[PDB]
């Protein structure tokens, strides 16, 4: 019955193109009708040549419209169709034998991760990461960038920019398609710059100027000068005017995390090079915000890995260091094992070639 079911799905996938962004039928009967045409053993026993014939790429942007101001309209707690969808979604992975499953495994997790990004808890999503990791060979180049996009965003909420760094690099290099290079790339580039917001670098606009429109260039340019110069007044006015753009991208959390980075980045911008820095010179610098926070401000920045200094309360100064040394014995050997580790990523090219 594999050919008979596949022949019927061939006519079903043609209708799903209309159901996606084109013809939505009814906002009530359709979501109940699309459920009864899937469950009755379309995925069957995994006999032969079974993949890409399910919904998969089509339903990502469909069900999100029915949940927001369509079927629910904040009249209920959650869509009963989505509750059953979460039951069918997690049942698809439970019955999977982990044999030929590559692309179909990573697409369903994209729903449970995206749901936690808007309404939900992302702490439980860390447990799914251990199950989510598989060497998927069937994922198309369009979905390889999206698979790396969600993995980098979850680590941002977890306060780790080091792990999310490797995922976001391969995300912008993939998805050559035009629609993925406009809406998906501009949203991904803002998340790539968000990693630099937590790192403290925030490079200038060179490649990102012509790659995206002026919509994403305005907030990043104002946040660049605000974090670098260490001005909380200009940083506060940026959040208020650009709040409309910050809410849709779930970037509104920068009012705390990135606000703490305004002080940390401004430390390296101003010159601490001299050893004994008097308390009055610190209060004058960084406008008046550095006057209220002096000893505590430097204390946490040292342990976090920004700078290395020493505070003396007796004479009222702070001994600072710029981290400058000369390679002699153990100094150059620290990067020796790192440069070898940097080449380990290139040692896999022997099996690829």
């Amino acid at each position: 019955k594999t050919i008979e079911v596949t022949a019927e799905i061939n006519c079903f996938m043609h209708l799903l193109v209309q159901l996606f962004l084109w013809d939505s039928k009814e906002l009530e009967q359709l979501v109940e009708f699309n459920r009864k045409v899937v469950i009755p053993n379309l995925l069957c026993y995994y006999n032969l040549r079974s993949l890409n014939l399910i919904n998969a790429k089509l339903w990502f942007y469909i069900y999100l419209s029915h949940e927001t101001l369509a079927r629910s309209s904040e009249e209920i707690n959650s869509d009963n169709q989505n509750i059953i969808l979460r039951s069918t979604m997690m049942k698809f992975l439970k019955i999977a034998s982990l044999k030929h499953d590559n692309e179909t495994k990573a697409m369903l997790i994209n729903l449970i991760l995206r749901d936690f990004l808007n309404n939900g808890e992302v702490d439980s999503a860390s447990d799914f990461i251990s199950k989510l990791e598989y060497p998927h060979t069937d994922v198309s180049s369009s979905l390889e960038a999206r698979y790396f996009f969600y993995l980098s965003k979850i680590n941002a909420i977890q306060l780790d920019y080091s792990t999310a760094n490797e995922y976001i690099i391969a995300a912008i290099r993939k998805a050559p398609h035009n629609s993925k290079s406009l809406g998906f790339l501009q949203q991904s580039n803002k998340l790539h710059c968000c990693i630099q917001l937590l790192m403290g670098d925030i490079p200038e606009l060179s490649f990102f100027h012509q790659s995206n429109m002026q919509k994403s260039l305005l907030p990043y340019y104002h946040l660049t000068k605000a974090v670098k110069l260490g001005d909380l007044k200009k940083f506060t006015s940026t959040i208020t005017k650009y709040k409309q753009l910050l809410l849709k991208d779930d970037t509104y959390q920068l009012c705390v995390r990135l606000r703490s980075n305004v002080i940390k980045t401004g430390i390296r911008i101003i010159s601490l090079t001299y050893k004994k820095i008097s308390l009055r010179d610190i209060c004058l610098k960084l406008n008046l915000d550095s006057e209220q926070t002096v000893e505590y401000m430097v204390s946490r920045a040292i342990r976090d890995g920004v700078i290395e200094a020493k505070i003396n309360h007796e004479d009222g100064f702070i001994e600072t260091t710029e981290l400058l040394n000369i390679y002699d014995s153990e100094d150059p050997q620290q990067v020796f094992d790192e440069r070898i580790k940097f080449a380990n990523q290139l040692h896999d090219e022997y099996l690829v070639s």
Binding site: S78, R86, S87, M90, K91, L93, K94, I95, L98, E121, S124, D127, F128, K131
Partner: protein, 849 residues
């Protein structure tokens, strides 16, 4: 939505609340298990509490967590201890997973305990919770009305109770269904499990089902006796014929036992029969007297020599010293094998006159293959050269002794004592070369005549000749003893022949011992590893040359992963070209059962910088694929014909001869340039010697036996490995080393014939089964089933493979038993009405019998 409110009650008191809690948790485990995985230490801690009676609920909840974690072993142990949540009747992706998870786990745990004890399935060594799974799984398979799924699981389970119990109760016998089902258990026993003790039980227990004779099959049971070579199963077959007296059944069963069994087992059935009583009609059956007559009489009625290709091949040039006459003498004995045609000697004076001693030694001994099969007049051909009939010269007189053993080989028990006194008489001293030549032919004659029979006198008599360190007759002594020592052998002859190799240093003697030490070990497998280790540790290339054949013969048939790895390791590290060639040739004897992997192994070795690497890969591909299919092996031999190396062309053309037998006429359309290059290389004098002599040998193999008999190795006729065929190919692996050994190929030829005889007395009637198929009888090199009649189905060329498309009609006076058995050796279809108008025509063998 979240399991947090459900997991909070897990650490609380009042387990009665946990009764309804675990019921509500178990439903959402298939979803929220990712969050539950952090509470696993709290779940397993409450499981060991005696006052906690809900542990059965936590057994299934904790099992589902590891179900999606990737480790299915932890979920099985927790579900079985509760003895409730495990239900084979429930069909679901989760339930069927833990039920099927214990299949391979039961096999892996039983295989480790199988070494210590084979009775483990009757004890508590295996977990009873895992044991009940194997018992309940068969109960589900019996309800599905499928015996292949039930017996397939019990085969890997190393349990003999389920195999016999599930098979016996299902016997409703249709009469044709459960005779075939027994064949699946016996085929998957020896061909898969390498242990002889495990397969021995399957072979013996399958005999009890057919004991009561509910229309049983005696052919499959005869193949069982050949494998084990047990005296109990052999005498049990005659025990059923003692109480039940039928002249048709008692004779037909003895016809298979004499053809299928080797020389060692054949002598056991003859001696042990007298004690329990014998049938005087079966005394001549096991003696092989009709077998020798069916070989000669077959070739007399249908006879095509095709001398036009033979006369043209030898008329090209009279040069090349005596190698030209020796090369054509090899193909001379093949074409006339069993024909008893002297036309080469009688009709041509000059070609015999220019030959030397060893060239006439080849031509005179060629009559042994030509006259092979004649147990009476075969001696009268050698009459003038007899010991005391003198001779034309003492060099040719030695050739009459080698040709005498070719005819009587295996039947030469009387010739063995005839040649024993000749060796002892000349064993005192030999001062000349020719006195060793006369003794050389005597040692090879007694070795072939006594081949397959253990004789301490032959081993002792040839030891004195070998002790004299003779470069001619001493080499045959080491090779002659190995033929009597075939089979398991004795450990005393292993150390004596091995130590003598390192004591006295001689190449041909060591090669005679290396091949000898390879022949004394047959089917021993791991039992011969003691002698194999001594050959691999020695740095001498002569000992390592024959070390590959020791692994080939002992591990022949069922192969070993460690034994094949040893043969591939020698051809790599060692730089000797002759050892690398001999190492890959030994791979063919192990792969004789499965020929699909043969062309894949030699394909990578077909391209190499060394010329000798391609040499051994040509024959090893042609050893198994000779009498078989898979014409793709010819494509591997195609580029070897263009190699400027002359020996490589000789390696390819000879291998093309054995594989293409009866394959001509548009089936594999390579015969245009292959049959043309035979006369093309001989005519052109610009080619080399090895390339020209290879065309003569390959030309005689296609015409061997008058284009009628074929070389059969591991076919349905015998059903097992042919001892005389394997040994003949081992000797065939040496060309330029000492002197041409191709004369030993006569033991690999078998006639293909369909004759019904009768149920009582020998007849050989001439009739036709009238079945349509492709015509291989009229297809010969020149100068689909429609159920339709055919011209003549009697003898001609036929073929074992294409015979299966030829059935047997019941419209004649003969009644079939097995409905076209299909074995040309045993034949003898049952006749329920002797002396009927079947148009009987007596053959020429009735004069001497």
């Amino acid at each position: 939505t979240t399991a947090a409110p459900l997991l909070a009650l897990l650490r609380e008191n009042q387990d009665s609340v946990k009764t309804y809690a675990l019921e509500s948790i178990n439903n959402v485990v298939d979803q929220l298990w990712s969050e539950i995985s952090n509470e696993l230490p709290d779940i397993e801690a409450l499981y060991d509490d005696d006052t906690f009676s809900d542990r059965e609920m936590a057994a299934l909840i904790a099992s589902k967590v590891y179900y999606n974690l990737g480790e299915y072993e932890s979920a099985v142990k927790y579900a079985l201890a509760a003895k409730d949540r495990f239900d084979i009747d429930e069909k679901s992706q989760f339930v069927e997973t833990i039920v099927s998870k214990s299949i391979e786990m039961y096999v892996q745990e039983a295989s480790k305990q199988y070494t210590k004890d084979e009775q483990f399935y009757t004890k508590d060594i295996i977990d009873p919770k895992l044991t009940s799974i194997f018992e309940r799984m068969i109960e589900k398979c019996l309800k599905a009305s499928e015996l292949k799924l039930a017996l397939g699981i019990a085969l890997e389970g190393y349990r003999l109770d389920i195999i016999e119990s599930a098979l016996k109760s299902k016997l409703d016998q249709s009469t044709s269904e459960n005779v075939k089902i027994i064949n699946y258990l016996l085929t998957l026993a020896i061909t898969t499990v390498t242990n002889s003790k495990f397969r021995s039980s399957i072979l013996r227990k399958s005999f009890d089902f057919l004991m009561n004779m509910p229309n049983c099959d005696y052919l499959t049971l005869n193949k069982v006796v050949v494998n084990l070579n047990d005296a109990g199963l052999a005498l049990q077959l005659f025990k059923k014929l003692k109480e039940e007296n039928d002249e048709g059944l008692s004779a037909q069963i003895a016809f298979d036992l004499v053809s299928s069994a080797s020389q060692q087992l054949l002598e056991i059935l003859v001696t042990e029969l007298t004690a329990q009583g014998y049938d005087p009609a079966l005394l001549n059956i096991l003696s092989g007297l009709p077998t020798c007559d069916y070989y000669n009489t077959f070739l007399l009625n249908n006879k095509n020599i095709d001398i036009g290709l033979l006369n043209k091949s030898k008329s090209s040039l009279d040069g090349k010293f005596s190698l030209f006459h020796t090369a054509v003498s090899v193909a001379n004995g093949f074409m006339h094998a069993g024909t008893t045609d002297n036309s080469f000697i009688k009709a041509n004076l000059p070609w015999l006159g220019k030959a030397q001693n060893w060239a006439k030694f080849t031509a005179t001994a060629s009559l042994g293959v030509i006259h092979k099969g004649n147990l009476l007049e075969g001696k009268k051909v050698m009459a003038p050269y007899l010991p005391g009939s003198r001779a034309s010269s003492r060099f040719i007189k030695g050739g009459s002794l080698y040709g005498l053993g070719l005819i009587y080989a295996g039947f030469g028990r009387d010739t063995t004592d005839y040649l024993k006194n000749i060796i002892v008489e000349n064993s005192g001293t030999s001062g000349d070369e020719d006195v060793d030549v006369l003794l050389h032919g005597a040692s090879l004659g007694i070795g072939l005549a006594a081949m397959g029979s253990a004789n301490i006198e032959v081993y002792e008599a040839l030891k004195e000749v070998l002790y004299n360190d003779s470069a001619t007759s001493g080499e045959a002594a080491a090779l002659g003893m190995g033929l009597c020592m075939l089979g398991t052998g004795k450990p005393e002859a292993i150390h004596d022949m091995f130590t003598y190799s390192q004591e006295t240093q001689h190449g041909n003697i060591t090669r005679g011992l290396a091949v000898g030490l390879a022949l004394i070990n047959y089917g021993r497998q791991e039992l011969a590893d003691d002698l194999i280790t001594k050959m691999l540790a020695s740095d001498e290339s002569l000992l390592r040359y024959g070390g590959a054949f020791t692994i080939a013969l002992a591990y022949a048939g069922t192969g070993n992963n460690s034994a094949v790895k040893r043969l591939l390791h020698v051809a790599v590290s060692d730089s000797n070209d002759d050892v690398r060639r001999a190492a890959v040739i030994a791979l063919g004897f192990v792969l004789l059962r499965d020929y699909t992997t043969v062309p894949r192994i030699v394909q990578l070795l077909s391209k190499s910088h060394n010329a000798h690497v391609r040499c051994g890969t040509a024959f090893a591909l042609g050893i198994a694929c000779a009498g078989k299919g898979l014409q793709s092996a010819i494509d591997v031999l195609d580029p070897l014909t263009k190699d400027p190396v002359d020996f490589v062309r000789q390696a390819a053309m000879i291998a093309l001869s054995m594989i293409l037998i009866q394959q001509t006429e548009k089936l594999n359309p390579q015969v245009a340039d292959i049959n043309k290059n035979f006369l093309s290389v001989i005519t052109n004098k610009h080619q080399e010697g090895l390339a020209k002599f290879g065309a003569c040998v390959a030309q005689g193999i296609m015409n061997a036996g008058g284009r009628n008999v074929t070389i059969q190795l591991e076919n349905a006729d015998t059903g097992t490995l042919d001892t005389k065929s394997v040994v003949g190919l081992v000797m065939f692996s040496q060309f330029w080393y000492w002197f041409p050994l191709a004369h030993f190929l006569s033991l690999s030829f078998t006639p293909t014939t369909v004759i019904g005889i009768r149920g009582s007395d020998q007849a050989i009637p001439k009739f036709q089964m009238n079945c349509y198929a492709k015509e291989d009888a009229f297809s010969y090199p020149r100068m689909k089933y429609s159920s339709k009649p055919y011209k003549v189905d009697n003898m001609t060329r036929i073929l074992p493979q294409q015979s299966r498309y030829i059935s047997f009609i019941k419209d004649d006076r003969f009644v079939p038993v097995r409905k076209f058995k299909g074995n040309n050796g045993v034949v003898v279809l049952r006749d329920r009405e002797p002396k009927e108008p079947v148009a009987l025509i007596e053959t020429v063998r009735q004069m001497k019998d």
